[PDB]
Amino acid sequence: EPRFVHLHVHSDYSMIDGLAKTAPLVKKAAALGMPALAITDHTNLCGLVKFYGAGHGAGIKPIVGADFNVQCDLLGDELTHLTVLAANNTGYQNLTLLISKAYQRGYGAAGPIIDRDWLIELNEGLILLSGGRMGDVGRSLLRGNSALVDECVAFYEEHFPDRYFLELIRTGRPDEESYLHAAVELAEARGLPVVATNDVHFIDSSDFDAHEIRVAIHDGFTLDDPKRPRNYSPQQYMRSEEEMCELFADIPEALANTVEIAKRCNVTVRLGEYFLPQFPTGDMSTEDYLVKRAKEGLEERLAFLFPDEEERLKRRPEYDERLETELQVINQMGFPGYFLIVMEFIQWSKDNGVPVGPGRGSGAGSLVAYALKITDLDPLEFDLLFERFLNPERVSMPDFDVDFCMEKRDQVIEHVADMYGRDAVSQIITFGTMAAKAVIRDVGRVLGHPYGFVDRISKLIPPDPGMTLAKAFEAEPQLPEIYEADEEVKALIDMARKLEGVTRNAGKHAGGVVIAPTKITDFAPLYCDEEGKHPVTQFDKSDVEYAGLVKFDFLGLRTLTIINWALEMINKRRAKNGEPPLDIAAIPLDDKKSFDMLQRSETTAVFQLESRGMKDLIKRLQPDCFEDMIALVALFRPGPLQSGMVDNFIDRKHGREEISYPDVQWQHESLKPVLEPTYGIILYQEQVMQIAQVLSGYTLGGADMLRRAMGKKKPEEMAKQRSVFAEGAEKNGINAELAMKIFDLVEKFAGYGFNKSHSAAYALVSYQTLWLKAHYPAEFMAAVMTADMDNTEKVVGLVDECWRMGLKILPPDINSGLYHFHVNDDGEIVYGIGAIKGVGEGPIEAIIEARNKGGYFRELFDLCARTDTKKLNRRVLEKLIMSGAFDRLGPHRAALMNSLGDALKAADQ
Ligand SMILES: [Zn+2]
Ligand SMILES: [Zn+2]
Q: In the record, which residues are listed under signal peptide?
């Protein structure tokens, strides 16, 4: 049984200090043979979820807490320290509110702050550590003011009677032992308990210098600056029980209370299971409302899939069943709410202006998702599996990985705030980390080096994303050279290896939106800027999800927004000619116009397929169906080619080899529908499941369990299932001895297998673009160019590509020009004026209001003299003059520039 437990500890999430990350701290506490650990960061619970995930895995009990800067009228302007532990969940939601109250209140340079009297209402379930020499009671003792001491203790004697402990710390800092003595006395005289703490900020004592620089970078000081605050001692590392016991041997009850307190603290953070909000229904069980909509959804989907042409009545069965099997699993696991929430949201986005990304996770395998128009692929057709997305044989959180554009966030939030409540909705925090370049940069400044000396090392660091220091040393031979040649450079880099990855701040921008069933502060604390605005959950995208809140991420995918513009343009065309608006989901997936094109390798602007190596793969492959469109992203990899698996796929398809299920030597003829569209090769994860379904007789639930069993790659569990495969073979009935011979291959073929529900989701959008480029190239290309206005080169290039595919693209004309590119009545592309760098949407809107205010622009003068000046700057006019927008009307550019002076004289009169 334990002698001591650390109740005051900081991680990098404190941001103003801390060095080690959450999990490592957990692992050190573990190695030290300790029962529990309390990470108490500065005014946040940012790593709380990670903390729990780690304590679970390491067999350590997490203790929730946080340090606070405090102010009470009693000490005036001066701030004091206070550590607050959550004994139970009543106190953990109080601690959350405190943190949220500090930030929501706004702050200045001292950071967020709490009023000690806030501890009056936010009280139950909390255990306070005095703060030590820096606490309100602590300072008074050193100041020697007895009345003050009595008056502070009177607050804790009243509001935290058995929950206030005098914190004793021996880190060899000024006025420590002095306070300790004074505190110990007060303790004995007032009957107050003490407790020992090491005020930990780093793991090993030798991490002290790395921490000092970590702080300095934040404090904006140079390391050797005399006026640089020196607030930490090397003793503030994570000490052992022994070290801590010998250290406080003269006051055991201080050590004993760490163990008592640790016992009194037990907070529950339920991870891995949703807390869904309530979907509008009326009088109907959320379960019931799902089926009414799912069935109505399947009605439409079936009418379309199988037109009145009542062949549907012969294939309708296979669907009605699937819907039920799913709908039952969904309703048993308490997820109908989720499916509805996403359904409705996706609908709202279609009606309003919001485009949502292609990512549906594994959801494309849900026939219910199909019915609710959450996914637009029919999973029956393409053997997309429901129990790969949501398997009742395991615990999981159904995620459609739905994301929208960060630009349209305020619009999205407004809608979910209407649907589920204003303070029920919130944005998600994002953290800044010191990457290789930036850490070299900042450690350089702190060690007193000019930006020139340092940038010479930062420039060696490759720009590749996810680049680490260790990789830079591998790729760039100059680094180890200069590292061993210069003692200063090597001290710089040694230190930057220690700080690499550390967290410096919050965004910047949020990661997305989250929706709680009640006010957000019930599930997470808030973070705010200096003025208590721009609130976000202190948990980030991953953590907030695991805490069991429904989230929607942001993304900068320009592909989906392009397709909107195309259809917009395309449908305006439909408006004049009196024909039905186009539903992009209703397009045929078998279209030779599109596929003949695909094979020509004309994929520029075709989402995903438009790289270089892909176009080589395409030529070599020659896909004629949507099936091998899905296979495309799965074949384009180092794994498949390194094994020749791709060279096989193409060879079979094209007759250079005869199909086999899967192998020439080992195979069976009952895998017909399973390995047919893949031409016999084991490509997708769903196929690994399906062979085990028909060959063995797995229930797809167990098939899914096996798929993962292989990924765990520990024989025990594989041997368990192995036998399950052999007897499974003979029951439904086949030849064994091959079930074992094919198994050890699918064992390996599942290795580089690919999630099909994920591929088809994206592949659909690739095809949707390929199609638009084939049947409406003008509208689509115009849309693509509207998406690239900000980049001139891309525009020029796209113009070439237009002319090459036989499109007529007209240069900037001030009379017909719009902000976005568009298509004229004759099917020609009109240059979007927004493409002219330095003009902007403002002036362009003005130019149009002017033009719609008559006809207009018989010449430059007619524009200048017309359009409101300063809505249209003279410099904005040069940009226009120089784009050749007036080339039709008056004289040409050079001659017009000279005339500009005059036209603006006349302009105002
Ligand atoms: Zn600190
Ligand atoms: Zn602290």
A: none
Alpha helix positions (H), 461-558: 469-475, 478-485, 487-499, 541-546
Q: Residue holding tokens 């003025």?
A: 531
My answer on whether 547 and 607 are in the same domain is no
Strands annotated E in 346-447: 403-405, 425-429, 431-433
The Å distance, Cα 544 to ligand 2 centre, comes to 25
Q: Please, what's the b/e burial string for 443-469 (b: 16 or more CB within 10 A of its CB; e: otherwise)?
A: bbbbbebeeeebeebbebbeeeeeeeb
Q: 48 and 169 in one domain?
A: yes
Residue 422 CB contacts under 8 Å (≥ 6 apart), including other chains:
none
User: Across 72-136, where does the E strand assignment appear?
Assistant: 80-86, 114-115, 126-129
CB-based contacts of 53, cutoff 8 Å, min separation 6: 23, 271, 546
Q: Which ligand is closest in space to the CA of residue 167?
A: 2
**Residue pair 757/362 in contact by the 8 Å Cβ criterion:** yes
- Of the listed ligands, the closest to the CA of 200 is 2
Is the domain of 383 the same as that of 516?
A: yes
Beta-carbon count within 10 A of 315 CB: 12
Which candidate, 442, 66, 499, places its Cα nearest to that of 219?
Answer: 442
Query: What was the structure determination method?
Result: X-ray
Q: Which ligand is nearest to the CA of 39?
A: 2
Alpha carbon distances (Å) from 114 to 67, 110, 120, 232, 311: 11, 11, 12, 23, 70
Ligand 1 center from residue 441 Cα (angstroms): 24
CA diameter of the chain: 98
Closest ligand, as measured to the CA of 15: 1
Ligand 1 centroid–CA 16 distance in Å is 7
The number of domains in the chain is 4
Residues 98, 84: contact at Cβ < 8 Å? yes
Distance 330 CA to ligand 1 centre (A): 47
User: From the CA of 141, how far away is ligand 1's center (Å)?
Assistant: 22
Is residue 888 within 8 A of residue 815, CB to CB? The reply is yes
In this structure, which ligand is nearest to the CA of 231?
1
Q: What is the CA radius of gyration of the chain?
A: 33
Same domain, residue pair 540 and 669: no
Distance 9 CA to ligand 2 centre (A): 6
Which of 268, 286, 302 is at the close of a domain? Answer: 268
Phi, psi of 309 (to 5 degrees): -5, 80
State how far the Cα of 450 lies from the Cα of 431, in Å rounded to an integer. 28
Residues 282 and 337 in one domain: yes
Of the ligands numbered here, which is closest to the C-alpha atom of 38? 2
Distance CA 861, CA 67 (A): 68
Residue 132 CA, ligand 1 centroid: distance in Å: 13
3-class secondary structure, 898: helix
Measured distance CA(555)–CA(510) in Å, rounded: 11
**What is the span of the domain harbouring residue 441?**
431-508
Distance of CA 783 from the midpoint of ligand 2 (Å)? 55
Q: Give me the resolution in angstroms, 1 decimal.
A: 2.9
Q: Which ligand is nearest to the CA of 67?
A: 2
554 phi and psi, to 5 degrees? -95, 160
